[PDB]
Amino acid sequence: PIPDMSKFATGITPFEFENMAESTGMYLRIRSLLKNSPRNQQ
Amino acid sequence: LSLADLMPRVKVQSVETVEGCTHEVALPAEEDYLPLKPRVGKAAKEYPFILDAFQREAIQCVDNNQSVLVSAHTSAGKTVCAEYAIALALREKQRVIFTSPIKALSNQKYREMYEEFQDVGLMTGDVTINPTASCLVMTTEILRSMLYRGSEVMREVAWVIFDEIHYMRDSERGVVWEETIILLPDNVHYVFLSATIPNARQFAEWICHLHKQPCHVIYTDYRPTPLQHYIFPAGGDGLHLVVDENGDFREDNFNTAMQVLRGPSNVFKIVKMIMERNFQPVIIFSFSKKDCEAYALQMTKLDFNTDEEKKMVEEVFSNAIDCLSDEDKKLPQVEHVLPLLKRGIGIHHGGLLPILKETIEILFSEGLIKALFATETFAMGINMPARTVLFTNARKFDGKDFRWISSGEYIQMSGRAGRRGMDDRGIVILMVDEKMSPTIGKQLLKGSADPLNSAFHLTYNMVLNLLRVEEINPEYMLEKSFYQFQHYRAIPGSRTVLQMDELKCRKRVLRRLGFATSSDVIEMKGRVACEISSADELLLTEMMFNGLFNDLSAEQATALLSCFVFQENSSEMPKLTEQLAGPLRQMQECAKRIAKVSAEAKLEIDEETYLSSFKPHLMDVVYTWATGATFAHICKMTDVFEGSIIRCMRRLEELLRQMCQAAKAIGNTELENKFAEGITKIKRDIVFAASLYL
Ligand SMILES: Nc1ncnc2c1ncn2[C@@H]1O[C@H](COP(=O)(O)OP(=O)(O)O)[C@@H](O)[C@H]1O
Ligand SMILES: [Mg+2]
Ligand SMILES: [Mg+2]
């Protein structure tokens, strides 16, 4: 029923991987500060 | 009158299970029901706890490679089922997609899944990470874009997981959501995760009708932590139990609560009572950003944190904003929240700087915030429950009238009480400031969740893209929408295909304006509209082809485009220099003509209303931002919340990317470079600071 993906791709600009990035390490840095929090102790 | 040629042929089979969950399966009526078979091989994933009955049942569906809707309370552990599908997909060297309705939630889910599977990526309208990952977390808008563009990323996808499908309507992604389900190939299988909904069977029947395969329904009302519901009448001194652990309404205590009748200070009293009784952590739900900030500031007399907890807050807070520039660290909102957080008092609403909202989420999720004053959106956050949930008001305003909150809203918010493991009970407290009957009180506190109803409607981008693609047409998506399926089931025997009249009128507009030929073949102008989804694709393309953007600088165009993504209905109009009021008048003239064409095409539309939807209250804010001002500066130019400014800026950046693709579709490198320059001029600093979850 649904045409193949190739038919959706013809006649339109392709999908682009926009706003590329890499892990800032922020979360794991914040996580280390929270070793003995009320939730980590319980 | 347009009658359907082929109607749904679906039957539902009940499947007996051990106590504690319901199992049904919708399947093609012509096929024989085949029970599921035991897992062949090892479990794709193992857990360090005993799975509940409904989880085992859902997991067996995945082991048999059959789609499943899991409808259960948030807290029952639906994510376990998604984790098994991801694990199985990676073991089989397949790709799997996990979609959320909101970008903020996708960021949280990316962290959760990355910490569990590592081989995870993220794709939103604000960031792309590890796009070759086996497991891709993304928003439903991204998935729609990949499908309409035939992205090869979809060829290896074996499983798609839709999270929180009951929230798609409120999230604004109601149409996008059904489009992705309708456009996915039939070889893909699904895990739908939903809150408890009364029409789960209906949804599975639709999926079965759509993809000609069985779709299971695993449903349970199970709550690992039982709740107790109290009413705190205005002026009263204590709490009145109105629904006990077993779900029995207490009509005696209810009237006794109304007896006390027959609110800043009241909020402080009740909160203080909660803290003295060790009912914290507490989430205080208010349906207004301002109420959240006011109530929070009334708690400044109190201090909930230990010295060791203050240090943790301070350290986390400084590490979080350390990514900001020294100019943005000094923003008033930044300096205003930290004294609260140190005292265990938090705030969470859309008006907040995203970096602070994420900081507050992480703090509350780790127990460093004992009293969080939040709007309804916080209930959709992942793994952030409390011991107590407090409702400051039983009524809200849905842009129409003061109505009591629905049972579904109460269930969604009240369901964040009760932390599994450390709470034996969950406490829910409903503040009531006026008279209310036992009937509606029982409906509110004991009524069932709201049904999941289709939000599908036609859009020009949808119609044009389906005209464009060969071997499919707009009529196909209409007949296969859940909106159409709900009609079939609500009125048995009816074959009328709804929305056809609207489809014809909308195509007349497209013809009369050169988007498509009389024979419904798409023009190059239409292919430009196919690139624009987040805003009025018709008007923006007409503006492009009339040249409105050619005489504008990047800053002017960027500022003018803010009128297409700004959505606040209670702001004061600023004064615009001719550099902005000029382009604004050109856009409005064009909008008038489209309104005229639409009316003549026999679409219901009001010219003034249509012109009013393009709100220019931030044109100057955006213009000055694009010309290099600081965020602190532009906040002084408006009463709009800082977080609402950033939300508009982020949707503006998303629209600009679509305008680049629009110009690119006709090789108009002039506008492409112009729209791209606007992006470069707004994508900086706290407004586009990275998510703390990355
Ligand atoms: N069967 C279970 N037994 C014990 N704990 C569970 C079970 N299922 C889930 N959990 C835990 O409960 C917490 C919340 O579950 P979650 O998956 O967020 O529920 P949902 O996402 O369906 O609301 C998680 O910390 C999870 O580890
Ligand atoms: Mg029911
Ligand atoms: Mg077509």
Side-chain angles (χ1 to χ4, degrees), chain A residues 4-5 8-9 11-13 15 18-19 21 31 37-40, chain B residues 115 123 128 148-149 151 155 309 365-366 468 527 531 653 657:
Chain A
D4 188 76
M5 298 154 50
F8 284 92
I12 188 163
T13 54
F15 175 82
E18 293 167 332
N19 286 324
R31 189 191 175 190
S37 57
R39 186 169 205 174
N40 281 124
Chain B
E115 216 70 3
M123 290 172 59
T128 299
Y148 270 114
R149 297 168 190 275
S151 168
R155 194 162 293 285
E309 290 170 336
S365 83
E366 291 295 301
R468 167 180 66 82
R527 300 179 182 266
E531 307 283 345
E653 186 269 8
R657 279 187 277 108

PDB file of all heavy atoms in Angstrom, chain A residues 4-5 8-9 11-13 15 18-19 21 31 37-40, chain B residues 115 123 128 148-149 151 155 309 365-366 468 527 531 653 657:
ATOM      1  N   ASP A   4       7.497   2.387  -1.777  1.00  0.00           N
ATOM      2  CA  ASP A   4       8.817   2.196  -1.196  1.00  0.00           C
ATOM      3  C   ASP A   4       9.437   3.538  -0.817  1.00  0.00           C
ATOM      4  O   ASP A   4       9.128   4.580  -1.401  1.00  0.00           O
ATOM      5  CB  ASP A   4       9.729   1.458  -2.178  1.00  0.00           C
ATOM      6  CG  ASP A   4      11.059   1.067  -1.558  1.00  0.00           C
ATOM      7  OD1 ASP A   4      11.088   0.094  -0.773  1.00  0.00           O
ATOM      8  OD2 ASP A   4      12.074   1.735  -1.849  1.00  0.00           O
ATOM      9  N   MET A   5      10.331   3.498   0.175  1.00  0.00           N
ATOM     10  CA  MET A   5      10.992   4.710   0.645  1.00  0.00           C
ATOM     11  C   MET A   5      11.624   5.483  -0.507  1.00  0.00           C
ATOM     12  O   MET A   5      11.645   6.719  -0.499  1.00  0.00           O
ATOM     13  CB  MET A   5      12.059   4.349   1.680  1.00  0.00           C
ATOM     14  CG  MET A   5      11.521   3.684   2.933  1.00  0.00           C
ATOM     15  SD  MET A   5      12.767   2.649   3.728  1.00  0.00           S
ATOM     16  CE  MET A   5      14.140   3.793   3.811  1.00  0.00           C
ATOM     17  N   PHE A   8       9.430   8.135  -1.923  1.00  0.00           N
ATOM     18  CA  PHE A   8       9.303   9.334  -1.103  1.00  0.00           C
ATOM     19  C   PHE A   8      10.517  10.242  -1.254  1.00  0.00           C
ATOM     20  O   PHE A   8      10.399  11.464  -1.115  1.00  0.00           O
ATOM     21  CB  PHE A   8       9.110   8.956   0.368  1.00  0.00           C
ATOM     22  CG  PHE A   8       7.724   8.478   0.693  1.00  0.00           C
ATOM     23  CD1 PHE A   8       7.410   7.130   0.637  1.00  0.00           C
ATOM     24  CD2 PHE A   8       6.735   9.375   1.059  1.00  0.00           C
ATOM     25  CE1 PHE A   8       6.136   6.687   0.933  1.00  0.00           C
ATOM     26  CE2 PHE A   8       5.455   8.937   1.355  1.00  0.00           C
ATOM     27  CZ  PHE A   8       5.158   7.591   1.293  1.00  0.00           C
ATOM     28  N   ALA A   9      11.685   9.667  -1.548  1.00  0.00           N
ATOM     29  CA  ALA A   9      12.915  10.443  -1.618  1.00  0.00           C
ATOM     30  C   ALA A   9      13.052  11.230  -2.915  1.00  0.00           C
ATOM     31  O   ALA A   9      13.821  12.198  -2.953  1.00  0.00           O
ATOM     32  CB  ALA A   9      14.124   9.517  -1.450  1.00  0.00           C
ATOM     33  N   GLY A  11      12.327  13.874  -5.705  1.00  0.00           N
ATOM     34  CA  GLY A  11      11.655  15.142  -5.879  1.00  0.00           C
ATOM     35  C   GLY A  11      11.587  16.010  -4.646  1.00  0.00           C
ATOM     36  O   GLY A  11      10.822  16.983  -4.635  1.00  0.00           O
ATOM     37  N   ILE A  12      12.358  15.694  -3.608  1.00  0.00           N
ATOM     38  CA  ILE A  12      12.400  16.489  -2.389  1.00  0.00           C
ATOM     39  C   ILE A  12      13.827  16.460  -1.866  1.00  0.00           C
ATOM     40  O   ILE A  12      14.571  15.500  -2.087  1.00  0.00           O
ATOM     41  CB  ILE A  12      11.405  15.966  -1.326  1.00  0.00           C
ATOM     42  CG1 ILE A  12      11.322  16.934  -0.142  1.00  0.00           C
ATOM     43  CG2 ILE A  12      11.807  14.570  -0.854  1.00  0.00           C
ATOM     44  CD1 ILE A  12      10.101  16.718   0.741  1.00  0.00           C
ATOM     45  N   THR A  13      14.214  17.526  -1.179  1.00  0.00           N
ATOM     46  CA  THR A  13      15.559  17.591  -0.634  1.00  0.00           C
ATOM     47  C   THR A  13      15.734  16.506   0.427  1.00  0.00           C
ATOM     48  O   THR A  13      14.795  16.216   1.181  1.00  0.00           O
ATOM     49  CB  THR A  13      15.833  18.971  -0.038  1.00  0.00           C
ATOM     50  OG1 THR A  13      14.814  19.300   0.915  1.00  0.00           O
ATOM     51  CG2 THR A  13      15.858  20.030  -1.138  1.00  0.00           C
ATOM     52  N   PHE A  15      16.800  14.294   3.802  1.00  0.00           N
ATOM     53  CA  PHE A  15      16.845  14.574   5.229  1.00  0.00           C
ATOM     54  C   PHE A  15      18.295  14.763   5.657  1.00  0.00           C
ATOM     55  O   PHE A  15      19.158  13.940   5.338  1.00  0.00           O
ATOM     56  CB  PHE A  15      16.198  13.436   6.019  1.00  0.00           C
ATOM     57  CG  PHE A  15      16.323  13.595   7.503  1.00  0.00           C
ATOM     58  CD1 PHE A  15      15.447  14.407   8.202  1.00  0.00           C
ATOM     59  CD2 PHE A  15      17.325  12.941   8.200  1.00  0.00           C
ATOM     60  CE1 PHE A  15      15.564  14.562   9.567  1.00  0.00           C
ATOM     61  CE2 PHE A  15      17.447  13.091   9.563  1.00  0.00           C
ATOM     62  CZ  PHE A  15      16.566  13.903  10.250  1.00  0.00           C
ATOM     63  N   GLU A  18      21.145  17.715  11.028  1.00  0.00           N
ATOM     64  CA  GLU A  18      21.408  19.106  11.359  1.00  0.00           C
ATOM     65  C   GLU A  18      21.707  19.268  12.846  1.00  0.00           C
ATOM     66  O   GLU A  18      21.279  18.464  13.678  1.00  0.00           O
ATOM     67  CB  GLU A  18      20.216  19.980  10.962  1.00  0.00           C
ATOM     68  CG  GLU A  18      20.002  20.058   9.454  1.00  0.00           C
ATOM     69  CD  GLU A  18      18.654  20.644   9.074  1.00  0.00           C
ATOM     70  OE1 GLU A  18      17.697  20.509   9.866  1.00  0.00           O
ATOM     71  OE2 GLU A  18      18.552  21.238   7.979  1.00  0.00           O
ATOM     72  N   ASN A  19      22.456  20.326  13.167  1.00  0.00           N
ATOM     73  CA  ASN A  19      22.832  20.643  14.546  1.00  0.00           C
ATOM     74  C   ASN A  19      23.656  19.521  15.175  1.00  0.00           C
ATOM     75  O   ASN A  19      23.461  19.160  16.337  1.00  0.00           O
ATOM     76  CB  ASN A  19      21.598  20.951  15.399  1.00  0.00           C
ATOM     77  CG  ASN A  19      21.005  22.314  15.094  1.00  0.00           C
ATOM     78  OD1 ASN A  19      21.727  23.270  14.816  1.00  0.00           O
ATOM     79  ND2 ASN A  19      19.681  22.410  15.152  1.00  0.00           N
ATOM     80  N   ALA A  21      26.566  17.394  17.023  1.00  0.00           N
ATOM     81  CA  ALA A  21      27.194  17.699  18.300  1.00  0.00           C
ATOM     82  C   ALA A  21      27.772  16.414  18.876  1.00  0.00           C
ATOM     83  O   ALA A  21      27.597  15.325  18.321  1.00  0.00           O
ATOM     84  CB  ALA A  21      26.202  18.333  19.278  1.00  0.00           C
ATOM     85  N   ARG A  31      26.682  14.286  37.637  1.00  0.00           N
ATOM     86  CA  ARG A  31      26.369  13.048  38.343  1.00  0.00           C
ATOM     87  C   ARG A  31      27.419  12.731  39.401  1.00  0.00           C
ATOM     88  O   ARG A  31      27.086  12.227  40.480  1.00  0.00           O
ATOM     89  CB  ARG A  31      26.252  11.897  37.343  1.00  0.00           C
ATOM     90  CG  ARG A  31      25.712  10.608  37.937  1.00  0.00           C
ATOM     91  CD  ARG A  31      25.871   9.450  36.969  1.00  0.00           C
ATOM     92  NE  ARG A  31      25.473   8.179  37.566  1.00  0.00           N
ATOM     93  CZ  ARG A  31      25.695   6.991  37.014  1.00  0.00           C
ATOM     94  NH1 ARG A  31      26.320   6.902  35.846  1.00  0.00           N
ATOM     95  NH2 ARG A  31      25.296   5.888  37.633  1.00  0.00           N
ATOM     96  N   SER A  37      23.471  11.758  47.639  1.00  0.00           N
ATOM     97  CA  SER A  37      22.231  12.515  47.637  1.00  0.00           C
ATOM     98  C   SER A  37      21.134  11.731  48.345  1.00  0.00           C
ATOM     99  O   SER A  37      21.264  10.523  48.569  1.00  0.00           O
ATOM    100  CB  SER A  37      21.814  12.830  46.203  1.00  0.00           C
ATOM    101  OG  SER A  37      21.673  11.646  45.437  1.00  0.00           O
ATOM    102  N   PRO A  38      20.036  12.391  48.720  1.00  0.00           N
ATOM    103  CA  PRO A  38      18.952  11.671  49.410  1.00  0.00           C
ATOM    104  C   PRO A  38      18.453  10.446  48.660  1.00  0.00           C
ATOM    105  O   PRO A  38      18.001   9.485  49.296  1.00  0.00           O
ATOM    106  CB  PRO A  38      17.856  12.738  49.540  1.00  0.00           C
ATOM    107  CG  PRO A  38      18.594  14.032  49.548  1.00  0.00           C
ATOM    108  CD  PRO A  38      19.772  13.839  48.636  1.00  0.00           C
ATOM    109  N   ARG A  39      18.520  10.445  47.328  1.00  0.00           N
ATOM    110  CA  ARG A  39      18.064   9.302  46.549  1.00  0.00           C
ATOM    111  C   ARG A  39      19.142   8.240  46.379  1.00  0.00           C
ATOM    112  O   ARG A  39      18.819   7.049  46.307  1.00  0.00           O
ATOM    113  CB  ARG A  39      17.584   9.757  45.169  1.00  0.00           C
ATOM    114  CG  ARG A  39      16.967   8.642  44.338  1.00  0.00           C
ATOM    115  CD  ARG A  39      16.267   9.184  43.104  1.00  0.00           C
ATOM    116  NE  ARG A  39      15.216   8.286  42.632  1.00  0.00           N
ATOM    117  CZ  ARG A  39      14.373   8.569  41.644  1.00  0.00           C
ATOM    118  NH1 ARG A  39      14.450   9.731  41.008  1.00  0.00           N
ATOM    119  NH2 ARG A  39      13.448   7.686  41.289  1.00  0.00           N
ATOM    120  N   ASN A  40      20.414   8.641  46.311  1.00  0.00           N
ATOM    121  CA  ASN A  40      21.488   7.663  46.188  1.00  0.00           C
ATOM    122  C   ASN A  40      21.708   6.905  47.491  1.00  0.00           C
ATOM    123  O   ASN A  40      22.148   5.750  47.466  1.00  0.00           O
ATOM    124  CB  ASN A  40      22.782   8.351  45.750  1.00  0.00           C
ATOM    125  CG  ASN A  40      22.809   8.653  44.262  1.00  0.00           C
ATOM    126  OD1 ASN A  40      22.993   9.798  43.853  1.00  0.00           O
ATOM    127  ND2 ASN A  40      22.626   7.621  43.445  1.00  0.00           N
TER     128      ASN A  40
ATOM    129  N   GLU B 115      22.696   5.561  28.913  1.00  0.00           N
ATOM    130  CA  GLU B 115      23.294   4.970  30.102  1.00  0.00           C
ATOM    131  C   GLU B 115      23.044   3.469  30.178  1.00  0.00           C
ATOM    132  O   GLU B 115      23.791   2.760  30.862  1.00  0.00           O
ATOM    133  CB  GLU B 115      22.745   5.654  31.356  1.00  0.00           C
ATOM    134  CG  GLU B 115      23.761   5.821  32.476  1.00  0.00           C
ATOM    135  CD  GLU B 115      24.828   6.854  32.152  1.00  0.00           C
ATOM    136  OE1 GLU B 115      24.748   7.486  31.076  1.00  0.00           O
ATOM    137  OE2 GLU B 115      25.747   7.036  32.979  1.00  0.00           O
ATOM    138  N   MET B 123      18.127  12.704  17.934  1.00  0.00           N
ATOM    139  CA  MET B 123      17.811  13.527  16.766  1.00  0.00           C
ATOM    140  C   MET B 123      16.563  14.341  17.092  1.00  0.00           C
ATOM    141  O   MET B 123      15.450  13.808  17.083  1.00  0.00           O
ATOM    142  CB  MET B 123      17.604  12.669  15.526  1.00  0.00           C
ATOM    143  CG  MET B 123      18.873  12.022  15.001  1.00  0.00           C
ATOM    144  SD  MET B 123      18.585  10.823  13.683  1.00  0.00           S
ATOM    145  CE  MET B 123      17.774  11.837  12.461  1.00  0.00           C
ATOM    146  N   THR B 128      21.806  16.770  16.968  1.00  0.00           N
ATOM    147  CA  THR B 128      21.950  15.438  16.395  1.00  0.00           C
ATOM    148  C   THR B 128      23.210  14.806  16.964  1.00  0.00           C
ATOM    149  O   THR B 128      24.289  15.399  16.886  1.00  0.00           O
ATOM    150  CB  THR B 128      22.030  15.485  14.864  1.00  0.00           C
ATOM    151  OG1 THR B 128      20.822  16.043  14.334  1.00  0.00           O
ATOM    152  CG2 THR B 128      22.229  14.087  14.294  1.00  0.00           C
ATOM    153  N   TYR B 148       8.622  11.203   5.030  1.00  0.00           N
ATOM    154  CA  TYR B 148       8.208  11.913   3.826  1.00  0.00           C
ATOM    155  C   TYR B 148       9.359  12.114   2.849  1.00  0.00           C
ATOM    156  O   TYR B 148       9.113  12.272   1.649  1.00  0.00           O
ATOM    157  CB  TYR B 148       7.599  13.263   4.192  1.00  0.00           C
ATOM    158  CG  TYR B 148       6.103  13.229   4.421  1.00  0.00           C
ATOM    159  CD1 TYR B 148       5.567  13.471   5.678  1.00  0.00           C
ATOM    160  CD2 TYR B 148       5.229  12.974   3.374  1.00  0.00           C
ATOM    161  CE1 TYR B 148       4.194  13.452   5.888  1.00  0.00           C
ATOM    162  CE2 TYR B 148       3.858  12.951   3.572  1.00  0.00           C
ATOM    163  CZ  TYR B 148       3.348  13.191   4.831  1.00  0.00           C
ATOM    164  OH  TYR B 148       1.986  13.169   5.029  1.00  0.00           O
ATOM    165  N   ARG B 149      10.602  12.102   3.331  1.00  0.00           N
ATOM    166  CA  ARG B 149      11.779  12.249   2.484  1.00  0.00           C
ATOM    167  C   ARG B 149      12.427  10.917   2.130  1.00  0.00           C
ATOM    168  O   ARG B 149      13.482  10.911   1.487  1.00  0.00           O
ATOM    169  CB  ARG B 149      12.808  13.154   3.169  1.00  0.00           C
ATOM    170  CG  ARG B 149      12.307  14.573   3.402  1.00  0.00           C
ATOM    171  CD  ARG B 149      13.214  15.351   4.333  1.00  0.00           C
ATOM    172  NE  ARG B 149      12.602  16.614   4.737  1.00  0.00           N
ATOM    173  CZ  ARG B 149      12.665  17.746   4.042  1.00  0.00           C
ATOM    174  NH1 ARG B 149      13.321  17.802   2.886  1.00  0.00           N
ATOM    175  NH2 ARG B 149      12.065  18.833   4.507  1.00  0.00           N
ATOM    176  N   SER B 151      14.131   8.765   3.836  1.00  0.00           N
ATOM    177  CA  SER B 151      15.483   8.601   4.353  1.00  0.00           C
ATOM    178  C   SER B 151      15.814   7.125   4.532  1.00  0.00           C
ATOM    179  O   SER B 151      15.034   6.368   5.117  1.00  0.00           O
ATOM    180  CB  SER B 151      15.628   9.335   5.684  1.00  0.00           C
ATOM    181  OG  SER B 151      16.827   8.958   6.338  1.00  0.00           O
ATOM    182  N   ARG B 155      15.359   2.083   6.546  1.00  0.00           N
ATOM    183  CA  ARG B 155      15.338   0.771   5.909  1.00  0.00           C
ATOM    184  C   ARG B 155      15.687  -0.351   6.882  1.00  0.00           C
ATOM    185  O   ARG B 155      15.172  -1.466   6.741  1.00  0.00           O
ATOM    186  CB  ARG B 155      16.289   0.749   4.712  1.00  0.00           C
ATOM    187  CG  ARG B 155      16.067  -0.446   3.799  1.00  0.00           C
ATOM    188  CD  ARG B 155      16.683  -0.240   2.425  1.00  0.00           C
ATOM    189  NE  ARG B 155      16.012   0.811   1.662  1.00  0.00           N
ATOM    190  CZ  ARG B 155      14.820   0.681   1.086  1.00  0.00           C
ATOM    191  NH1 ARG B 155      14.141  -0.456   1.195  1.00  0.00           N
ATOM    192  NH2 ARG B 155      14.299   1.693   0.406  1.00  0.00           N
ATOM    193  N   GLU B 309      23.289  19.140  51.892  1.00  0.00           N
ATOM    194  CA  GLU B 309      22.450  19.242  50.704  1.00  0.00           C
ATOM    195  C   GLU B 309      22.617  20.598  50.029  1.00  0.00           C
ATOM    196  O   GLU B 309      22.588  20.689  48.797  1.00  0.00           O
ATOM    197  CB  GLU B 309      20.986  18.985  51.078  1.00  0.00           C
ATOM    198  CG  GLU B 309      20.705  17.525  51.451  1.00  0.00           C
ATOM    199  CD  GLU B 309      19.319  17.304  52.050  1.00  0.00           C
ATOM    200  OE1 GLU B 309      18.741  18.261  52.606  1.00  0.00           O
ATOM    201  OE2 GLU B 309      18.808  16.167  51.966  1.00  0.00           O
ATOM    202  N   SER B 365      15.165  15.181  40.907  1.00  0.00           N
ATOM    203  CA  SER B 365      15.270  13.744  40.687  1.00  0.00           C
ATOM    204  C   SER B 365      16.246  13.088  41.653  1.00  0.00           C
ATOM    205  O   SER B 365      16.186  11.869  41.840  1.00  0.00           O
ATOM    206  CB  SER B 365      15.696  13.455  39.246  1.00  0.00           C
ATOM    207  OG  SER B 365      17.103  13.542  39.102  1.00  0.00           O
ATOM    208  N   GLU B 366      17.135  13.865  42.268  1.00  0.00           N
ATOM    209  CA  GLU B 366      18.093  13.342  43.232  1.00  0.00           C
ATOM    210  C   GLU B 366      17.718  13.677  44.672  1.00  0.00           C
ATOM    211  O   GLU B 366      18.499  13.397  45.585  1.00  0.00           O
ATOM    212  CB  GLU B 366      19.493  13.869  42.911  1.00  0.00           C
ATOM    213  CG  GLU B 366      20.072  13.307  41.618  1.00  0.00           C
ATOM    214  CD  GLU B 366      20.314  11.811  41.691  1.00  0.00           C
ATOM    215  OE1 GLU B 366      21.079  11.376  42.576  1.00  0.00           O
ATOM    216  OE2 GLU B 366      19.730  11.073  40.871  1.00  0.00           O
ATOM    217  N   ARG B 468       2.734  14.742  -4.424  1.00  0.00           N
ATOM    218  CA  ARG B 468       4.063  14.584  -5.007  1.00  0.00           C
ATOM    219  C   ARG B 468       4.435  13.114  -5.153  1.00  0.00           C
ATOM    220  O   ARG B 468       4.830  12.664  -6.235  1.00  0.00           O
ATOM    221  CB  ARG B 468       5.094  15.313  -4.142  1.00  0.00           C
ATOM    222  CG  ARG B 468       6.540  14.967  -4.460  1.00  0.00           C
ATOM    223  CD  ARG B 468       7.506  15.727  -3.568  1.00  0.00           C
ATOM    224  NE  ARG B 468       7.401  15.336  -2.164  1.00  0.00           N
ATOM    225  CZ  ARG B 468       7.983  14.263  -1.633  1.00  0.00           C
ATOM    226  NH1 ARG B 468       8.712  13.444  -2.382  1.00  0.00           N
ATOM    227  NH2 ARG B 468       7.830  14.004  -0.344  1.00  0.00           N
ATOM    228  N   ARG B 527       6.530  21.975  -4.356  1.00  0.00           N
ATOM    229  CA  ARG B 527       7.664  21.283  -3.755  1.00  0.00           C
ATOM    230  C   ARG B 527       8.391  22.170  -2.757  1.00  0.00           C
ATOM    231  O   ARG B 527       9.014  21.665  -1.816  1.00  0.00           O
ATOM    232  CB  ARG B 527       8.625  20.812  -4.845  1.00  0.00           C
ATOM    233  CG  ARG B 527       7.989  19.853  -5.836  1.00  0.00           C
ATOM    234  CD  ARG B 527       8.965  19.418  -6.919  1.00  0.00           C
ATOM    235  NE  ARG B 527       8.311  18.540  -7.883  1.00  0.00           N
ATOM    236  CZ  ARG B 527       8.312  17.212  -7.822  1.00  0.00           C
ATOM    237  NH1 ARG B 527       8.945  16.581  -6.844  1.00  0.00           N
ATOM    238  NH2 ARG B 527       7.678  16.510  -8.751  1.00  0.00           N
ATOM    239  N   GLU B 531       8.702  21.512   1.895  1.00  0.00           N
ATOM    240  CA  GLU B 531       9.839  21.630   2.799  1.00  0.00           C
ATOM    241  C   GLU B 531       9.478  22.307   4.116  1.00  0.00           C
ATOM    242  O   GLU B 531      10.255  22.220   5.074  1.00  0.00           O
ATOM    243  CB  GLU B 531      10.969  22.415   2.118  1.00  0.00           C
ATOM    244  CG  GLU B 531      11.396  21.878   0.747  1.00  0.00           C
ATOM    245  CD  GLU B 531      12.277  20.642   0.836  1.00  0.00           C
ATOM    246  OE1 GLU B 531      12.796  20.358   1.936  1.00  0.00           O
ATOM    247  OE2 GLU B 531      12.451  19.956  -0.194  1.00  0.00           O
ATOM    248  N   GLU B 653      14.717  29.212  14.814  1.00  0.00           N
ATOM    249  CA  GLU B 653      15.868  28.549  14.209  1.00  0.00           C
ATOM    250  C   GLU B 653      15.440  27.311  13.432  1.00  0.00           C
ATOM    251  O   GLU B 653      15.989  27.017  12.362  1.00  0.00           O
ATOM    252  CB  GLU B 653      16.883  28.182  15.291  1.00  0.00           C
ATOM    253  CG  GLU B 653      18.197  27.608  14.768  1.00  0.00           C
ATOM    254  CD  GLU B 653      18.189  26.096  14.647  1.00  0.00           C
ATOM    255  OE1 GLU B 653      17.118  25.480  14.821  1.00  0.00           O
ATOM    256  OE2 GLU B 653      19.264  25.519  14.379  1.00  0.00           O
ATOM    257  N   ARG B 657      15.799  26.761   9.256  1.00  0.00           N
ATOM    258  CA  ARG B 657      16.370  25.600   8.583  1.00  0.00           C
ATOM    259  C   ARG B 657      15.431  25.087   7.500  1.00  0.00           C
ATOM    260  O   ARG B 657      15.878  24.652   6.432  1.00  0.00           O
ATOM    261  CB  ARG B 657      16.686  24.501   9.600  1.00  0.00           C
ATOM    262  CG  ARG B 657      17.997  24.722  10.345  1.00  0.00           C
ATOM    263  CD  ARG B 657      18.385  23.539  11.223  1.00  0.00           C
ATOM    264  NE  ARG B 657      17.715  23.566  12.524  1.00  0.00           N
ATOM    265  CZ  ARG B 657      16.741  22.743  12.907  1.00  0.00           C
ATOM    266  NH1 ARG B 657      16.289  21.789  12.102  1.00  0.00           N
ATOM    267  NH2 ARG B 657      16.215  22.876  14.116  1.00  0.00           N
TER     268      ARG B 657
END
